[PDB]
Structures are given as structure tokens and as C-alpha cells.
Design a protein around this ligand. Structure first.
Ligand SMILES: [Ca+2]
Ligand SMILES: [Ca+2]
Ligand SMILES: [Ca+2]
Ligand SMILES: [Ca+2]
Lengths: 787, 137
């Protein structure tokens, strides 16, 4: 009849008591109301730490390690401004939204150098230093894999790692300051407003500090992956294309506006299906000319953000270009390509196969001028493609094949995605030229990529992101599994397999060859009449009894109920079931650029464009690039940081429980807690156990060193050798067993006193033997010096 | 090379070296215990003895490494560290000297009790043969 955590809509969990039981449910009486009893599913009720004011630096010190006790432990620590907490070697980091004094000072930096994780308070610096020490000693490059929502403190977190590593282990070159100066450039081309986040990174970013043989910093390198190409051409409402487009439209001089033929964003297909409004405040709104503002901007006003501002960010972006060496010519070259892409998107077509509409004539002219193409060549390559008359070896002829209207749209957009992506590659390579190096032995890299996410409606974009994260979560789990097994061997716990339920089957469901969802989607393209519904039935037919696939009717939510079996599927991901509506999956799986048109852009009049450039589906290109990311991570040692956004209002000292619970789930932390339940999830140093329980022992035992105190106590109590493991530095416990040990220390003092009296012989022996074998050890060390 | 019994016994010895309890002996710590038990090895003899066994190369000695780093004359010279004046016998005042040099905290009641449980013949002190019998249980 002890306290438990039970669900609460805004705090995540609340403390309560179990007053009745049910078939799959428990009846909970909250402490904080007493008679608004409610039902909770059994797997949503968790045991609670007795001491509600206790906080621990490592959550493994808890007697029950579960998502509710983790949530509460980090709440209590957040209230005392301790934003950092471990789960073993994993770092949880809650954004304070204010500048914490002293924890990032040069003196603190110094105090973390060389120190083991566990001998200092939790900190991003301890993660950086662990990466450093393993790199130096094991001769192995390192990864630091950060999860979290956009704006969850990840940007700041990366800065702390780079600053720590350069100031501690570098020689005067301020590499981390050069990456920060480049940032406004990267964000302009690679970030965008989403439904939930004004400044969301739409690419996987891996920032490397490179080291020589002497483990000293030599340079930097930004690896980039998986830029989200679909955003370039279309966006949902409440979302925008990449920031660059809006910064250019709002901030460019009238002179550049006329040279690139820009106008308000509502005039461009590639902007005007999404949100066409600027981030501005009262002052910056006055600096944007009226001819840059869309009808919806003039009507509903500007978008609001405490940092983002398109006019101001334009200036700041041009300043960042100057600092990375970009002259005014290369800057206008970038803008010219951007405007080229915008005008490209306004070209329409009509059933003649097809033809440029007459209204689209000036878009063509402007696009062609800006991308350095002949108007006529462009017109033809958009409406026609070449083809060989044969396929399998025999001598063939070139023929001209006209495109239908929908195929012309596709080539137009394909060309846009290719130009924009190549421009992005150029921008990143340009950043990397600000801190180059000829050679390196190893690197420490920090990864930032969009996390697992779901909405009411989930399309192909979500499917890809959640697939990316399913694979990253398997990587997270493999490495924690390995770290734990190694900890247990290192500590002398003996033979211990930990029960691991792999998520390989979900991964196979998505990506396996021929039978995976992606290959079945590819197969749909090949049929005479490709259909989203045929693709979806084929998935359900081939994986009829797959553990991780269900039809939409089986959903636990209401709103998915009327979705037909052929309109969607559910996937049981690591973080939870997601229902995907499959409408448009087939078209979103295609963005190939046919060859005459690609060859055309490669031989643009303009040299900058030619330099940018010098039959696979979107799904499989995604898989391929994802696998290169994983190849890189798999070749390194891995450490993990979980950044948490405490609320949606950027306010300090406001812990929003359910929002944080949600992020703990989506970031894979809960899945890792389940995994650790198969091992020894609770552990405590002899020093912690000594301080907790010495008050219950005779002064005799209270005078022992912590390790012998614990040995005596554990022997005295006659503890079951399966559940309790006496390691080198800590006592390890199977699930629930630290709580059970605690009850023995509290429930029957007369029993405990007799058991202690009876261990007196064994203890006096162990205390002789200890010192005896220690003098014998000091003798053998003298003899080895004598060799 | 070593029996199960003796590996366990050296594990308890190891914690005597490893005071902070971090599962590892530094150079500083290794010196503290040898010098406290009447020895004068030097900063280069320690460091060079450590480097010849530091397999993982992390500047530090874990328990496995301590084992390799490690002949009744050793046992007899072990006894002679407790036997300051060397009458072949360890008193309560002499055990108290090695205990407190080692870092062990106790009152003389406690010291006297230890000496009694090991003292088989009842003369108030601990001879060499009774010293070995403990080690081996
Ligand atoms: Ca130590
Ligand atoms: Ca070592
Ligand atoms: Ca003597
Ligand atoms: Ca005697």
C-alpha cells in the first residue's frame, strides 16, 4: 500500500495510491485531492521513490529506475538549477533558458579535464572529456549523439562541447568561433519554419573537431546528410521553405530585387502553398518595403520570434558571408541561383504531349537568364526528354520523346531540388574552407538531426524521419547494451546475459530488399497504373502478420478509425505507434531528373553554376544516405546527450511535466530504461550505501571503510546471490531489489541486530585478511622493483 | 596462475590501495600504502613498474593489472611489518600502529578484540603461525 506514480495530463505523472484492482487497470486515489479516483492501465503505473525530496546525479542510484522516477528526479534537480543528470553514461540536459553562473567558466573547464564520469557533478564537459580520453587512449574517433526538439538547447550544447575541446586540448586556434560565425549561413540554406518550430534544422549535421597523433586540435569539418528536398518545392500550411528565400525577399536592396526579379513570396509556387509571412517585430516591419509583403502578411501581421527576423537575419547572413571570405560577387552568385530556382517554379504547362503556358513566358525568361540557360533549350528540356531506341546492348538511336503535363512539372521540380541541394553542398564546403587541415588521426563529432515525431496526419516526410530515428535508436540500444555488459565484467559481476528485444524487425519492415515498404513503393512506380491504394494493400498483404504493422482501424485513437486499410498503415516504432496516411506516397517517392535537362544545367553559361555540378527513388536515396551516416557512427565510440525543452514559452523555472515526458519517450530514453531492466539497473557506490545505512549499525561497523561496511552488511543479511551482486566499486541490483534491501534495513531492527552480531567472527577475519594480504602485496611490489 | 580464493583476497587488498573507491590505483595512492608500511620506493620506480603492466595504457592500474603486477619469506617479511621490535609477536599497540598507518579507524577495545580472536593460545599477542591460519580461511 505504498505510493505510486500514475498518469496526469499536464505533469505527466502524479503521486497516488492503489485502492482497487481491475483486469488490465488499477484504480488510483490521488494524494492531492483524495476522492477524484480514476482508472489507469497497469503498465502506466510505476513505483515511486519514498523520499520525494531526494535527488541523485545518476538515475541508476534510484531504487526504481523507470520513466516516472526519472521524470521526477530531473524535476527536483531542475528546481535547484541542476540541468544535467546521468543515466549511467547518458547525459540528460534540460535547457534553463537563462545563463547559469560559473558552470561554464574557464575554471570549471579545467576542473573536468582528465576526470572520470562519476567523480564530478553531471555536465556536458564530462561527456566531451570522456570522448577525448577514449579517442586518445583507444586510438578511436568519437561521436556525441544529441537528441531533442528544435530549440531544446542543442545549439548551445554543441557550442559547449566545441568550446570545451578547443580551450582544453587545442593550441590557440579558435575553431569553435569560426563555426559559430558560419552558422547564420548554414541555417539560411538548411533551416526552415515547421508547424512546431520557427527555426528547424532540416538536415543531419555532424560537426567534427579533428586531432593529430598528439591528440591536439588541428581543424574542423561539417559533414552534412539528408537535406529535406521536398520542402524546396512545396510546404504545408504553417510551414515555409528554407529561410534563405524569405531573407532574400524581405532584405535585398531594390537594386538586387530588380536584378533577380523578386517580389512578395505569394508570387512564387515554391513559397505560396505554405506560410508566406515574414518573421518581424514592430521596428523591423518598418524596414521591409511594402512590395515585399504578401496579402496574408498585410492582413494577419508578421510571425513572432524572440530571435528570428528575416530582414535582420538577411543582414546578419551577408555579414557571415564576409567573415568566411565570400566577396560581393560570390554572394550575388548565391542569390542569383536562389532566384533562378524561384522563377523555375512558376513555369506551368498545358495539354498540347505538353507545352509551356503563354502566361509562363516571363518566368522562363527570368529563370533562363539567372541560371545561364538559353530560353529555348530550357523550354525543350522541360517538355521533352531523350531516350535510346534500345535497352539491352544492341546498337541504338537517340529519339525525342515528349512529356505529358505531369511529367513536365516533375522535371521542373527535379531540376529545382538538384540545383538547390548542390547549392547547399557548396555552402557547406565553403564553411569547411574556414578551418581546413591536410591531415588528422581522429575526430570528435557532435550529431544533430531531427528526432522522432508524430502529428494527427503523418505523410512520407514523417515516415522518412521516423525511419531515420528507428535506425539511430537501434544504434543507441546496441551501444548501451555493450557499455552495460562491459561495466558488469569490469566490476566482476560474472556471467550475465541481458534480455534484449531488438527492433531489427521494424527496420526490416521498412527497408528490407524486395519485401520492405520502400521497395514495394518502388515497385508501385513500375505498374501500368500506380496507385497509393495498391501500394498500401501490397504492404498489408506481404506483411499480414508482422508484429509492427497494423491497419489504421486497429488504432487506439478515435480519429484514425474511418481510414480504410488501403489509405494507411500503422508502424509500431521504438517510441510508439504511428499511423501514416499513404496518400501521395507514390509521387513523393519520385524526384528523378531526366538526363537532357541535367546535362543542360551542367553546361550553364554561368561558371558558378557549372561548378555546383562538378533512376533511384526518394525512399532508396534516403536509405542510402542514412546508411552512410550510420557507417560513420558505427566506426566511432559513441556517447549520448538528451536535450530537453522544459516548456513551449522559452521561460525559465517552469518545468512542464507531460511535455518533458513526451520528449523522454520520443528521444528513446524510455526504450533504453526498458533495456536496462534486463541487466542491473540500480547501483550504488559503497560510499553512498555507507552514508544511507550506517546510522542503523553499531559504532563498531560504522567505523569500517565503506567497502568492508557493505561487505559485512551484505554477508550478515544473507542476500540472494541472483538479485544482489557485490562489484568492485558498487553494489548492483536486479529490478526492485534495492527497494527490497532498503525494507530489510528498515522493517525489523531486532532481526537486523541479531544478524549483525552473528557476522562478528567473519568480519574480524576479513579485517585481518584485508591488512594481511595488503602487506603481502606491498612486499611483492618491492620484489618487482627488485627485477 | 592464482586460485579463486587468492584472487578474492587480493581484491580486498586492492581496496586498501584504492581509498577513493573509483576502482583504480593511481601512482600517488600506490606510494601512500607502501610508504605507510615502511618502504621507500621512488617516483621513477613506481611509474616504470606501472607502465610495464598498464595494458590498456590509461596511466592507471585496474584490478586485473594489479594481479599481474604482484616464497614463504614474503609471508614472513609480511609478518615483520607488524613486528616493529621483532620479538616474533604482535601486540595490541603494534597492530594499532600498522592499522592507523594504513588508514583504519578504531578504538583500543576494537584492536584488543581483533588480537584475541586470532590469538589461539591466549598470551595476549599474535605469533607467526597463528598469523598464517587467518590468511588461509
Ligand atoms: Ca583510486
Ligand atoms: Ca590501466
Ligand atoms: Ca613485536
Ligand atoms: Ca599468541
Amino acid at each position: 500500500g505504498k505510493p505510486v506514480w500514475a498518469p496526469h495530463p499536464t505533469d505527466g505523472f502524479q503521486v497516488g495510491n492503489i485502492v482497487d484492482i481491475g483486469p488490465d487497470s488499477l484504480t488510483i486515489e490521488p494524494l492531492n485531492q483524495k476522492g477524484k479516483t480514476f482508472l489507469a492501465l497497469i503498465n502506466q503505473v510505476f513505483p515511486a521513490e519514498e523520499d520525494s525530496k531526494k535527488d541523485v546525479e545518476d538515475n541508476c542510484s534510484l531504487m526504481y529506475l523507470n520513466e516516472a522516477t526519472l521524470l521526477h528526479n530531473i524535476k527536483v534537480r531542475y528546481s535547484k538549477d541542476r540541468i544535467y543528470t546521468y543515466v549511467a553514461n547518458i547525459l540528460i540536459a534540460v535547457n534553463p533558458y537563462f545563463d547559469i553562473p560559473k558552470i561554464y567558466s574557464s575554471e570549471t573547464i579545467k576542473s573536468y579535464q582528465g576526470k572520470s564520469l562519476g567523480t564530478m557533478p553531471p555536465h556536458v564537459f564530462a561527456i566531451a572529456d570522456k570522448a577525448f580520453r577514449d579517442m586518445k587512449v583507444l586510438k578511436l574517433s568519437q561521436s556525441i549523439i544529441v537528441s531533442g526538439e528544435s530549440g531544446a538547447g542543442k545549439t548551445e550544447n554543441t557550442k559547449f562541447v566545441l568550446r570545451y575541446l578547443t580551450e582544453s586540448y587545442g593550441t590557440g586556434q579558435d575553431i569553435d568561433d569560426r563555426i559559430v560565425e558560419a552558422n547564420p549561413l548554414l541555417e539560411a540554406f538548411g533551416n526552415a519554419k515547421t508547424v512546431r518550430n520557427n527555426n528547424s534544422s532540416r538536415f543531419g549535421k555532424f560537426v567534427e573537431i579533428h586531432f593529430n597523433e598528439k591528440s591536439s586540435v588541428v581543424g574542423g569539418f561539417v559533414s552534412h546528410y539528408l537535406l529535406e528536398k521536398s520542402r524546396i518545392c512545396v510546404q504545408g500550411k504553417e510551414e515555409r521553405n528554407y529561410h534563405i528565400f524569405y531573407r532574400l525577399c524581405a532584405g535585398a536592396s531594390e537594386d538586387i530585387r530588380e536584378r533577380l526579379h523578386l517580389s512578395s513570396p505569394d508570387n512564387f509556387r515554391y513559397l505560396n502553398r505554405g506560410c508566406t509571412r515574414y518573421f518581424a517585430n514592430k521596428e523591423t516591419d518598418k524596414q521591409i518595403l511594402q512590395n515585399r509583403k504578401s496579402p496574408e502578411y498585410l492582413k494577419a501581421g508578421s510571425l513572432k520570434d524572440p530571435l528570428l527576423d528575416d530582414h535582420g537575419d538577411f543582414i546578419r547572413m551577408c555579414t557571415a558571408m564576409k567573415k568566411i571570405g565570400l566577396d560581393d560577387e560570390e554572394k550575388l552568385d548565391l542569390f542569383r541561383v536562389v532566384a533562378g530556382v524561384l522563377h523555375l517554379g512558376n513555369i506551368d504547362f498545358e495539354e498540347a504531349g505538353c507545352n509551356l503556358k503563354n502566361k509562363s513566358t516571363q518566368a522562363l525568361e527570368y529563370c533562363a537568364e539567372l541560371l545561364g540557360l538559353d530560353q529555348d533549350d530550357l523550354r525543350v528540356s522541360l517538355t521533352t526528354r531523350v531516350m535510346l531506341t534500345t535497352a539491352g546492348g544492341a546498337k541504338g538511336t537517340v529519339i525525342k520523346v515528349p512529356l505529358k503535363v505531369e511529367q513536365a512539372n516533375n522535371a521542373r521540380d527535379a531540376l529545382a531540388k538538384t540545383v538547390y541541394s548542390h547549392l547547399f553542398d557548396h555552402v557547406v564546403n565553403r564553411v569547411n574552407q574556414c578551418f581546413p587541415f591536410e591531415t588528422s588521426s581522429y575526430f570528435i563529432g557532435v550529431l544533430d538531426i531531427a528526432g522522432f515525431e508524430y502529428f494527427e496526419h503523418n505523410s512520407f516526410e514523417q515516415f522518412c524521419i521516423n525511419y531515420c530515428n528507428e535506425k539511430l535508436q537501434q544504434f543507441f540500444n546496441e551501444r548501451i547494451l555493450k557499455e552495460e555488459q562491459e561495466l558488469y565484467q569490469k566490476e566482476g559481476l560474472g556471467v550475465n546475459e541481458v534480455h534484449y528485444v531488438d527492433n531489427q524487425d521494424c527496420i526490416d519492415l521498412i527497408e528490407a530488399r524486395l519485401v520492405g515498404i520502400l521497395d514495394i513503393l518502388d515497385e508501385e512506380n513500375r505498374l501500368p497504373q500506380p496507385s497509393d491504394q495498391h501500394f498500401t494493400s501490397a504492404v498489408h498483404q506481404k506483411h499480414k502478420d508482422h508484429f509492427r504493422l497494423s491497419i489504421p482501424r486497429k488504432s487506439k485513437l478515435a480519429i484514425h478509425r474511418n481510414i480504410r486499410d488501403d489509405e494507411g498503415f500503422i508502424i509500431r516504432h521504438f517510441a510508439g505507434a504511428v499511423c501514416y496516411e499513404t496518400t501521395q506516397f507514390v509521387e513523393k517517392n519520385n524526384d528523378a531528373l531526366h538526363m537532357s535537362l541535367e546535362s543542360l544545367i551542367c553546361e550553364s553559361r554561368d561558371k558558378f553554376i557549372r561548378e555546383l555540378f562538378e533512376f533511384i527513388s526518394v525512399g532508396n536515396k534516403f536509405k542510402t544516405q542514412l546508411n552512410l551516416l550510420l557507417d560513420k557512427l558505427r566506426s566511432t565510440g559513441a556517447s549520448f546527450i538528451r536535450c530537453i525543452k522544459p516548456n513551449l514559452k522559452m521561460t525559465s523555472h517552469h518545468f512542464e511535466g507531460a511535455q518533458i515526458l513526451s520528449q523522454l519517450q520520443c528521444s528513446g530514453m524510455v526504450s533504453v530504461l526498458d533495456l536496462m531492466q534486463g541487466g542491473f539497473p540500480s547501483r550504488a557506490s559503497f560510499h553512498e550505501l555507507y552514508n544511507m545505512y550506517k546510522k542503523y549499525m553499531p559504532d563498531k561497523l560504522a567505523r569500517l571503510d565503506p567497502r568492508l561496511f557493505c561487505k559485512a552488511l551484505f554477508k550478515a543479511l544473507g542476500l540472494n546471490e541472483i538479485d544482489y551482486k557485490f562489484g568492485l566499486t558498487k553494489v548492483f541490483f536486479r529490478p526492485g531489489k534495492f527497494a527490497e534491501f532498503d525494507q530489510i534495513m528498515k522493517s525489523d531492527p531486532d532481526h537486523l541486530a541479531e544478524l549483525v552480531k552473528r557476522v562478528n567472527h567473519w568480519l574480524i577475519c576479513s579485517r585481518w585478511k584485508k591488512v594481511q594480504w595488503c602487506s603481502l602485496s606491498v612486499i611483492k611490489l618491492k620484489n618487482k622493483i627488485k627485477y | 596462475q592464482l586460485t579463486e580464493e587468492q584472487i578474492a583476497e587480493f581484491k580486498e587488498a586492492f581496496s586498501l590501495f584504492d581509498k577513493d573507491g573509483d576502482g583504480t590505483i593511481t601512482t600517488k595512492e600506490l606510494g601512500t600504502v607502501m610508504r605507510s608500511l615502511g618502504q621507500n620506493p621512488t617516483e621513477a620506480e613506481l611509474q616504470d613498474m606501472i607502465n610495464e603492466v598498464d595494458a590498456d595504457g590509461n596511466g592507471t592500474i585496474d584490478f586485473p593489472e594489479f594481479l599481474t603486477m604482484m616464497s614463504e619469506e614474503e609471508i614472513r617479511e609480511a609478518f615483520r611489518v607488524f613486528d616493529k621490535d621483532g620479538n616474533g609477536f604482535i601486540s595490541a599497540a603494534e597492530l594499532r600502529h600498522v592499522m592507523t598507518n594504513l588508514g583504519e579507524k578504531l578504538t583500543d577495545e576494537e584492536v584488543d578484540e581483533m588480537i584475541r580472536e586470532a590469538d589461539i593460545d591466549g598470551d595476549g599477542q599474535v605469533n607467526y603461525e597463528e598469523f598464517v591460519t587467518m590468511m588461509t580461511s
